[PDB]
Design a protein around this ligand. Structure first.
Ligand code: 4Y7
Length: 241
């Protein structure tokens, strides 16, 4: 009935529609783990072939997040500068949070190209510290056993943050932020899940991992550029020069 319960439903609708795999598909496929021969197959690939595979999965993942953001009540109504500011700082942070759904804490593997594989699968990329940091972040997030609605509401808040440097209409973003915080806290009370609030990762940690990740992606993109058919061209122009 309330404007808030309608917001909860729409955020969860936007989320469910902008998700590539459904949680049950990822959950059932946990048994389908890459063989040592398949692992060796991936480790023996060139850095540049592994970069191409990962770059295209990450760009497709960002594209689903841009679509998620576009479907968030109020986003399209913000100025284009603000829309860029929010997506530039937050789209990859959302991708990093969404990744915990495809992560298995039991064996420390991620669902990649049809099967579950460990971080060793990525050996050829030569950025083990970064990749270990990503798996660690997914490991901490997997302990929360986040529900699909919780991930939807939390990621909307990762994106709609009025504290991002460069916002031109801070107040309009704050209004959207306040409504989403109410939606999230209202839903956690209703479901007796307010306990996750003290367990969420510190804001600086997600920011920090994201900045390290995007910085590496930028280094690879400079060395071996991939072209992408941009869903949001003004955002695309801010990262792809
Ligand atoms: O409009 C689009 O279709 C669009 C696609 C994108 F993938 C991003 C995107 N890629 N990306 C990358 O880090 C990236 C990715 Cl995901 C793959 C390779 C290189 C890059 C890096 F470094 F060159 F930009 C981002 C980081 C934050 C925020 N957005 C992005 C942005 C877009 O506007």
């Amino acid at each position: 009935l309330t404007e808030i319960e309608h917001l909860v439903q729409s955020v969860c609708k936007s989320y469910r529609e902008t998700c590539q795999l459904r949680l049950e598909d990822l959950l059932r496929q946990r048994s389908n783990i890459f063989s040592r021969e398949e692992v060796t197959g991936y480790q023996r690939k060139s850095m540049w072939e592994m970069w191409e595979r990962c770059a295209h999965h990450l760009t497709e993942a960002i594209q689903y997040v841009v679509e998620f953001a576009k479907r968030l009540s109020g986003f399209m109504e913000l100025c284009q500068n603000d829309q860029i500011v929010l997506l530039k700082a937050g789209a990859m942070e959302v991708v990093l949070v969404r990744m915990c759904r495809a992560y298995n804490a039991d064996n420390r593997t991620v669902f990649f190209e049809g099967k579950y594989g460990g971080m060793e699968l990525f050996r050829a990329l030569g950025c083990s510290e970064l990749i270990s940091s990503i798996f660690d972040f997914s490991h901490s997030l997997s302990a929360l056993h986040f529900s699909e609605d919780e991930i939807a509401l939390y990621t909307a808040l990762v994106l709609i943050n009025a504290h991002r440097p460069g916002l031109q209409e801070k107040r309009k973003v704050e209004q959207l932020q306040y409504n989403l915080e109410l939606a999230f806290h209202h839903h956690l009370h209703k479901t007796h899940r307010q306990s996750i609030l003290a367990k969420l990762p510190p804001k600086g940690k997600l920011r920090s991992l994201c900045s390290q990740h995007v910085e590496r992606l930028q280094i690879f993109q400079h060395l071996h550029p991939i072209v992408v058919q941009a869903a949001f061209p003004p955002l695309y122009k801010e990262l792809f020069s």
